[PDB]
Every structure is written in structure tokens, then in C-alpha cells.
Design a protein around this nucleic acid. Structure first.
Lengths: 64, 49
RNA sequence: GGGAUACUACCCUGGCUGUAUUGACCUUCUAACCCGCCGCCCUUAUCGGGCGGGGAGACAGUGUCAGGUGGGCAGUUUGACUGGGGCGGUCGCCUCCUAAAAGGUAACGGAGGCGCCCAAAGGUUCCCUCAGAAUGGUUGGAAAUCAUUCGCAGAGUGUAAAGGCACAAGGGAGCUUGACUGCGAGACCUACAAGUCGAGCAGGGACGAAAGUCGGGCUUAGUGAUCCGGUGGUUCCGCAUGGA
RNA sequence: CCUAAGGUAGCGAAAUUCCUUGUCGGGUAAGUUCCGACCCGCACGAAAGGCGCAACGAUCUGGGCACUGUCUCAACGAGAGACUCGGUGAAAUUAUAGUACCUGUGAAGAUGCAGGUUACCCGCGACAGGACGGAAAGACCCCGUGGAGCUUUACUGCAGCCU
RNA sequence: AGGCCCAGGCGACUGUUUAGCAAAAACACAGGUCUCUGCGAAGCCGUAAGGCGAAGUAUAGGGGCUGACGCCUGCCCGGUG
RNA sequence: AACAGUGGUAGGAGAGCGUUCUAAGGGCUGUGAAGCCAGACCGGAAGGACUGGUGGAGCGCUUAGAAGUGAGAAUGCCGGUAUGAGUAGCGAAAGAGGGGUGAGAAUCCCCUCCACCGAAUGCCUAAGGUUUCCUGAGGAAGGCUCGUCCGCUCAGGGUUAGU
RNA sequence: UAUCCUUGGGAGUCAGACUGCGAGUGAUAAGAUCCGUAGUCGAAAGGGAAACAGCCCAGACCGCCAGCUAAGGUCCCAAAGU
RNA sequence: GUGGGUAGGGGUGAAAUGCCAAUCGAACCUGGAGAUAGCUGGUUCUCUCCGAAAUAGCUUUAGGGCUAGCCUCAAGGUAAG
RNA sequence: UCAUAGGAUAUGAGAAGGCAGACCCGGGGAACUGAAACAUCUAAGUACCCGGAGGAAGAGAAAGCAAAUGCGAUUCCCUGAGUAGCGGCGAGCGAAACGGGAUCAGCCCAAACCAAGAGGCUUGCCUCUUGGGGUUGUAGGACACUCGAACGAGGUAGAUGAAGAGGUCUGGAAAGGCCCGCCAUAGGAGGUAACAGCCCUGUAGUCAAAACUUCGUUCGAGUGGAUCCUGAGUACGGCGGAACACGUGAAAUUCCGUCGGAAUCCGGGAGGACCAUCUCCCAAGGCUAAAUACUCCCUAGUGACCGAUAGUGAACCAGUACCGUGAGGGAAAGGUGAAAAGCACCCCGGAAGGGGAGUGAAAGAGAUCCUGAAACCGUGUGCCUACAAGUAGUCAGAGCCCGUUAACGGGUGAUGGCGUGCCUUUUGUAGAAUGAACCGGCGAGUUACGAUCUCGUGCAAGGUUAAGCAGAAGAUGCGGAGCCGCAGCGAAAGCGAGUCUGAAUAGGGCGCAUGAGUACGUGGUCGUAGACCCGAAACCAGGUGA
């Protein structure tokens, strides 16, 4: 039984060159009137996962 | 799992779609083309062999 | 008096009769369906089943769907902290002390507040200055509204504490909507998620002659993940192709 | 003022009374019990029946006569065990043990540690103070994001029934 | 091969029950009351055929409640059914 | 050679020891292998030799390989043997004596008294048991002791229905 | 003086206690509870404090019938000064 | 007394959670099944190098778990400490 | 008493029931558990019950796959791929086609019309049986034109089958040691008093069948296209369900129950809602072997599989004894010797049991009878012990005794110093916290498939085969489908050492530029599997009991 990829993560992450995983920002769904425009602009951009979380979820994204 | 603290993946949002149509082209750079002789005709079938 | 509509054939100003269709109340029966009613036969059988009679009757029964009721029955939930549990109280955020002169630092330790508000209580230019007290002044005093003097902040600062503010961040007037878009060198804070500041660049502005200020409140609370769904724009994809 | 209506008859410190051994009387030398009465019934009450009731009860409570070893307060006697001999012959338990007493220390309660005090070696009959003695991975309590039974206007369903 | 007497709670009584802790004031009881059912009764077992009810017919069956007998059983239908 | 270091739980890292089989090379073994028993030997350890006794056919060394590979605890499972301990118990009850048999007699046979039941401990007969019933032999086990004895063992034999 | 940082492989730890010192709660009670700070134990034997984890001195690679000391101590138990 | 019936999301019950083969708040036997157990116990040869923590955050979370701190091994920066 | 049930008789290698605890179809269909609770979901259409045949079954010749100078029945293996997707978008579940292989078979009907006979007549509207009539999509066909033997190979019983008592040594016994020979298409295996190619049975080769039994050889068309047919309560739709990887969702596709309900070649269905054009195809009728699955069996063999607490529960009179009313549960127990040659005879004894004698290589080998460990129980003894309390030792140590794998030896030790076992769990255990009565055996982190990292290898901008076919169940050969890199950015179109954002040729993010990965092996760890081993109360399915 070959390993099963975690689809709930595969629908959210993407493995860039050098092996890092790209992610979006949370807190960007349906409340925006309670957030100043600065943080909204900042969270619009995409980010990358942290070192510890990367170390934790290494296995879950083995097959891209 | 993260001890009931909701995992990072579920905290994060989902991204866009993927479609059946997709022309992935076998990339070959000019640096590779030097291996052929002068004045030759290079075509995908020849590249295969 | 406005077009007084006087020899197409108006839609009925909406009326009914005679004509094929739909629902309820009526009664019928063969005729379905039913009969734990009777006579005969299958048949020495109180099963059922063939005939006949009789009673009911398009109902009921049964099939599919739908609604109500339904602890009769079934699977489950019914939180944590806790000077043992239960009961009481609390659960997120913001201010201070506890806090041992960096930061951080607990207790069911000691005190308060927040789940907003402001089209001006924002931005900018310009101009000032307080609370209280004494003395004269009527309606009018302890205080309304005046005039003098004293007066470093006692008064204010939307609100809860602290920090900080009279070179205004306090008070007043005119104009205005930067309470902007694309961003962002760096840095703080941090397990993660997030949170915070940020010069500087471009596009257009507002204010002012200019300098130059403006990416919301004087600083810190006034707010929540993802999923799913709704709405607007889309120079994206849309399963043979064009559309959807 | 309020309710839809405000407990009537009967009974009442009761199988119901915390105050509580209510207060009074009887019984007894002496009565937190009992019996009779009073009502201030925390929190009786009329088919969850109320109040009495002859008879009945291995029912519960109080008192009295007769009786006696229940007792003051023990004594003796008979038989079966126990006890000695003969035959036969287990079990629970068990880290190893040449297994003293005080005071103190210590995971706060010492046989084994400390300082002293006592104690020749081995047996037989009895006692149960200790070895936190044995039997039972505590039935009490607490915690498992344990289980089971039961309940309801907890949630979601189902059978039945009605339309 | 009976001890007896006086009183009092509870239960009318004979009976029955927790085999293996509890035999009682608990259960039953005859009696009373309310309610359902017109007979392919209702209620109940079963899916259904089949049954019990009953080869019975509101003076009979099912269910709820109280429990001999004597005297009685008051008010409220606002709420739930 | 110099210098420094070398407590250690949870843990991380490296060095090794042994066991069973498998391949290659070597050879040990009835002139006694394996296993077991006893030694006062060797290595830093896991461990390994050597010399005797037993035993009577298989087995080390060398390099590599693969593992059912290393036990002191799990109230672990199975088998054996201790402890308590020659202790508890020996399962309601009247036997006494004289003969007999016999290797051996409280217990077996015969005799004489005595004693117990007698709406039964008597006499028939169900369910049920399935040879336990009878005769002749035996006493290892069963018999809570003994046993010459029997509901035990062995060899024979035994149940007759028209009512 | 030579331990620091980056990447990567593998963990366990989430019950801590006591003793100084600065505080809370408590009654400036507790071998109480909760903090900050330092130490020991935890995971550390040895000598001392009679016996003792946390108090003092002090770190065990082994052997020696060597020497000097730390806390503590020198009349006997019991080494050393009546 | 004899012969029969009622079988476990059941049957019986003069009603105690009583009885249903010494088992009953849901009998017994086999199977799903090596159910699951954030809990308790136990986990076997030796030497050497280094060597902790009992804390922060979040958690239906408090005796559990994930990340950070602390340990260890290796490759690098090399001299930052 | 038209006529039917019903009744009576006769004829039927007709069915039933079992089975292999396997495999395949279906009908019916759980919970435990995961989700760290729990109801959607999962477990799982699994366990279990029921019906049905097969040696295999299901499937099947296109109302298909797919979008191209196209493929052409089904089935199964690798690959696609843990991808596209589905999912309280959680937990999880999860394909197919293209491509490469094994295997290879395509056929028969209904309808049209002809013929007759079929009678009802309402003169073909229906018969029913044959045949022509036929099985088809860039349509086809009607219709007019066209020709139960003998033989080889096995299977079941078997036959034949080379070479040394070679000498010598030990020994109870040669197959063993030393020195010599021979066969070998035979050096497989077993037995033979110890280890055998040459001792025996046999082995390699070569033969054999009276009788049954399994495999291979004999005894039709093409041209035309007026008219007709090309599968009706069927497709399909509403409603409610189920299967498709797909949970109602955009929900295509298949099937079920209720109701509704088409068209007929100018026609219909599909290409993932749905419409149009195009492409492909002809359902509502059947049959179809091989590749594939599985062993209660039989034959011949193999094992870096066990060797009597193992291995089947069962090596042995085992599903037995035994337990239970019953379903059912369910043991222990291998070994004398080469040959019984198994102990003549004598003595104690009633016997049992002994002592002798005898057999044998061993009697210590005597009916658990090869070896015979430890616990446990005894008998002799060298030293010590009745004024001393001791986790029982160690370090000092006199005395007494003995003399070794010879070495600054062995046993015992009066007396002194020090000193509270082991294990788990704990901040802390001598602990009065837990476990062990003792001895022996057994008894716990592995294996498969993927992932990742270190290390080691062969190649390197390349690496590499899988299935499968040959091949002593092997290596090796072939097998380039397929997979990972050499290019990244973006959600995507798409662009490309750049790309995304953005009006930007500005800034910023992402690998730039600062080029090794791949195949395999060991090792660490992880993921799915019971996953490290023992333990629940309890749940669900099917039965057994009044």
C-alpha cells in the first residue's frame, strides 16, 4: 500500500523550487470591514510555511 | 495532528483550480543543441533517439 | 365643451344563453375489490375454492409519495479550571499593581473597562489658552450670562487606566475627503497562526504662496480561523468544437 | 396586592416536627422511648384517598404477672474436638533471612537504619499486640473526550397510528 | 402435645415475593371508581397468513387508580393532557 | 611523545560478545563429537580456552550472509519440587468377647450376648444407573486407617411371559 | 578562554522537591501553594551533620599496606592537643 | 408426579430488577476479533563518547498531544561565542 | 353433468441430499472501530445468513473508446496514479482511456415477404411447423436483377539396470584412518551392527499392458433503392432509492419500486447538466472457448521451514479421554538394544523388590528403557558453632585442615570496621507502595508495500526498467510502455532564465546567476497493515437451552 497524499493539504500548498512550500494567508475570507486596508493588502500576497511546520508536514506532501 | 489545536492546513485557505487542458512542453535549451554536428536538421523524432 | 367615436369591424364598458372538457353531494348496479354471512359441489374437511344468493362497495385493503403525531423503540451528546468532587465563580480582548530600576514572569491575587462611537470628534491652513478663586454686576442664589486680577495645568484630551500633550496631541474658523490605489528597504513581536511600525517609489489628488503635511481618531481595547453559500468585476479556465 | 382557585371536613411534635429530650399530665426512684392532651402543621388532608374500625399478624413500639445462669458471679458435672500413642496425611502463604526492647531518624507509624538497654542452644501447650497479617489489581471518592440500564418539553431517527 | 394480660402504630383478613442477606408497613385480594370497546369489539403477538380476546357479546371483555367494613371524599378547567 | 579528559537517569552515537542455520576454505571426531559434571587458566566486558569424569555419534575454526538471536520479574503459561507439616482433617451412630482363616487381623468369616430403626434404617416398585447381580480366585491402585476383605481387578455364570 | 551559528537525521522531557534571597495567597502558620533568582537532588557516590536527597565540604576510568588538605574534629567509644 | 408450550432489541413475573441450567439493569456458545484501551504491567548480551527536561504557547485540555526551549550525530560558516 | 377444476391408471439413470472451512454469481446485510467526542461518512457491501452452477464461473463482439492521414469482442498483468476527482473539502475514499504484454472465434434469432397446411370466415386480420429470410450503420435486409472405427503418445501394476567381502589398523560391529583398484548417460535417496558411486533396495538410460482411461488423424455472390422490416407499455421523464472513485452536487451513466410515457431511417442513442454543428454507434433478443481465480484431493519433487512446551489441536488408537443438558470447549502422552540375545539357575521375600549368575560393546541398559541439568530430599565427613541479636556479605584477620590449569595457593574461619535485597513507579522507596514460593522451558519493536535521510556502489546531464517472453522455482538475454531529473513563474490562459503582482521599461515574491541525479543494497525514522507484547467492561450477526 503506497502512501496516500493528504488531499486537504494538496489543495492548499505548492512545492516551489528548492523544496519550500508556498502558502496563502489566513484571515482573508469574509471579514474585511473590521480590518484596515494595510493588513488586507499585506495578506493578499502569498507567503511560505515556517521551518517547524515544514519539518512536521514533510511526510504529508511526499508526492507533490 | 496538533493536539486538537486546528492543524495549519485547515487554518489556511484553499487556492485555485486545475484543468484537464494543459500543454506541458518538453523544455530543451540552446546549450543542448550544440551536441549536434554542423548543418544538421534537428526534429522531435530525432531528439527522441 | 376636448377627438360628439355618422355606412373597417373595436378590446366586450364585461353580460348569457344552447356546445366538449374539471370537484364536490347524491343513488345505482353490474363491474371490479371485500365478506371471520347463507345453500350446493370439490369433500367421510368449521382450511380454500367453483357456482348461486345475499350485504357492502368505487369506499375499504394493498402499492408509491407526502404531512402530522410518535422515549413504544434505536444511536448518541450532556465542556474545562477547581488547594477532592458537586454547587458557586470564570473562559476572548484592553489598562495598571503585584513584577525583585531591560524585556518576560503565576495564583479561584488586588483594582477597572471593551464586543463601540465620530461625516465630523477625520486631513490640512490659520488663530489662541485653561479649572478654580476674589471683587463689582438685577431677573439671578453657591452656581446661568458679564468686567478686572491671580492662576504650570488643578481643566481638558469621545470612553477604562497608564504614558504623553499648553512650541499643542487642548479650544476656534475656512477649505477639503489621504477614513487613497499599487507597494515597501528594513525592523519589532514571535512555536505556529497571526499582530505592529516603517522611511522611500509611482498614479492621482486634498490643503496651503511655499516649505511641506495627509495611507483615519493623541497612543494602547471596540473583535474571530477554515469550509460552505450570497453579491459585483473579471484582458482566466470552461471535458469533440461554439456556447453555456 | 395577587391567583384559575386560595386547604373545607377530619387528624396533628405523627412511619410526616430541623426548633426538639416542644409544653402539660400518666406511668417509673429516676423515662431523649411510650400513652393522653395543646397547636406556631419548616414540610397532614381527602381515591398517591381522609378518619376509626371487631377479627387477624413468626409485623413494629411501650408496660405488666410467671419464669428462670440474661445478670451480681461465677461453680461443678456428661459427651465431641483439642492433648499423648498408633495408621494416614493436605491447604491458604512464601524476595533471602542467624527474625529482641526503648528513644530518635526516615516516604512523617522500623525487626532489619542510629545510640543505648537487655537477651545461653532447641522444643511442647495456650494468647492474638505487630509483621500497616492472608483472602480479594477498593464495591466509597476522583479521572478515562470508558461501558451499560433508565428518564425527558436534550439532539437526530425508527415502528405504530392519523390524514 | 398454648405462656398469658394490658395498650398503640401499619396492614381489613387467608395468601405471595428479593432461589442464595431483606417475608415487611411491599405485592395480591374481594369491594369501589374512571375510561375504552356494537363484535372481522377494543387491546395484544405476528409483517402476513393466523390467532388469544371468545366457540364470549356492554349484568361481557381491556386498561388506569384505590384497596374489607362504617362515615365521607371540599374548591380551582388559568396551564398540560 | 606531549597535553587534557574518562559519575550518570530519559535519551543520541560508536565499538563489540554470544546463539541457530546457510555458502566458500581449511579439518575435528569410536585413538570418543555433541551435551552434562568439576577444576586453583585467559581477556577490559559480553565471554573463551585448557585438564579430568560422564556420555556414546556427530562438530568447531576462518570470511561473509539471514535471523523465531540472548529473560529476573508481566498477581505471565506449562511441568516438577518445596514451605506451612508429620500440623488440620480422617465426613452424626455401641459394640464386647471366644473360635476360624491367614505371612500379617480392632477392621475379613462363624458363634454368644449387648445395642439402634421399626409410617422405617422394614417390604415391593418408578425415573434413573447399565453388570455394579452370582460363583471361584487376587490385593498395585480405589477404600480419608488396616484389610486375608468388595459396589476394586481377573476367569466364568446369570434375566425364559397369549394373561 | 574556545564555544558559537546554518542546514539536515533521532529523541525524551510537559507530576518536580528542598535550601538561601525578593515577593504574593495564608494568620508575613505549615515538610502549604504560586512566582523570580542561585545551588543540590532529580540524574551524584565519597567525608561531616548520630541514623537523613535535597544543609556543609566535595565529583568516583581502574590498582597501591603512599603523601597533603576541605567541612568537621583531637577525654573514651572513635584518628588526632587532658 | 408424568407429557407438553412461551427463547433473549425476547420469554415469564400475586412486581423483588425477581427467574430463564450454581451466570441476568438484559443468558449461553461460535464468529466480526489479535474489537479499542490518551490506562496499568512487562520488554531479555556487554563496553565506550556525549548527555537532558519536569518549562512557554495552543488544545472538550489538564497524568494525553503538536510546535518552541533543553540533548545527541553528521556536513558546513569558520572565529562569529 | 356444454366444460373445467378435481379424481383414477400407466410411463420416466427426473428432483431431493451431500460436499473442499477454497473460488464465482447473486438475494439479504451489522456493530466494534477511525473521525483522537458523534449522527453525514468509515469499518464495508466486509463479517454473517440464504439461493444457484461451474470446474472454473461472471464478461463479451460496440446505440463502445477516442478527437486522429483513428482504433475495432471480452478477460487478466504493468503503467497510468495516489494523478483527475469525491469528501461534516474532515477522517478518509479513489478511477478510466491512451501505451506495453498473455490469449484470441465469431456466430444464431424476431421482423419483414414466398410456400403451403393450418378456419375462425367479418375471404387473410391471427394461426402454428417448417423451410427459403435474415442478421446489417461512410446502413442492411425484404423486393427486382447473380451460383459412429483403426491409428501415435501417455496414465494407472512393473521389468532390466556398471563398478571393490581389495589389502591393512582400531573397534562389538567398517561405510572410518593408511596404501591400492574400478564404474560413471548411474556421485538421487534410503537402509546396511559407525560416515558407502562400486553391500542391498535402487539411481542414469532402455523397455513393458490382458483390462479401463486422457490427448490428435478417418466419416455462395454483386447491381438497383418504388414500397416494406430492422427488438413498445420498450427507451425516456416526474417521484423515492441504490451502483458508478462520484455523499444531489454542474451530476453525466446503469438498475430498481410507483406513476406517466416517445420515434421507426427525412429515424434514433452517446461524446459528464443542457442546447446547436460535427464525430462515433444501432439498444430495448440469445450463444460464445483461451488468457484469469481457487486446492478437500492424487502423483513426483523442493526448502539458508520445525524437530516432541516446537511443528497441525493431534508424530503416540485425537477431535480421543475429560467438561457441558446443548451449541460447544478440549488436553497430556515420541526414544531399551544392532539384534530380545528382555534376564536360565540360586538365595532373602507372600509377593513386590532385591543380591548374586548369564547375555550384551555398555545391566550405572532391565520396560519413562539413550543423555539425565536445577529446584527438592538424604548419608559420610575437613573447619566452625550454646553470652550472642545483624539484607548474611565484603575488607582486615589468628587458628585448624588440604595441596593447584603453580600462584604474591584452596577450604573453613574465632574477632574488628563498614553496610536497610532486586524490580517497577516515583520529586522521593530499606521502605509499612507494587511483583516474584523455588527450579527448568517458553515469552515481547518484525515482515510486506511506499516515503524520506545518511552511508556504499555503477553511471553520469542522464539514470532506469515494469509487466511479459526465453531461461536448473535461478542468473543472464530481450522487453523503452512507463517513472525521476536537466527550468522556473503564475490560480490559469500563458511566458520563459525569466516569470507573477502591478498602469510601471518602478519596487517586491519565487529557483536566477552559485550544473547532479538517477538504479540498487545496508542502516535510522515515518505512513497503511493487529504493527510491541499481555488485559478490558462492552457492541453486532448466527445458532443452543423452560
Amino acid at each position: 500500500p503506497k502512501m496516500k497524499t493528504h488531499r486537504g493539504s494538496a489543495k492548499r500548498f505548492k512545492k516551489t523550487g528548492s523544496g519550500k512550500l508556498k502558502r496563502s494567508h489566513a484571515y482573508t475570507s469574509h471579514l474585511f470591514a473590521n480590518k484596515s486596508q494595510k493588513q488586507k493588502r499585506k495578506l493578499r500576497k502569498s507567503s511560505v510555511v515556517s521551518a517547524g511546520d515544514f519539518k512536521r508536514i514533510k511526510q504529508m506532501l511526499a508526492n507533490i | 495532528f496538533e493536539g486538537g489545536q486546528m492543524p495549519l492546513f485547515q487554518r489556511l485557505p484553499k487556492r485555485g483550480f486545475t484543468n484537464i487542458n494543459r500543454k506541458e512542453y518538453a523544455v530543451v535549451n540552446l546549450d543542448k543543441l550544440n551536441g549536434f554536428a554542423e548543418g544538421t536538421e534537428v526534429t522531435p523524432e530525432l531528439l527522441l533517439e
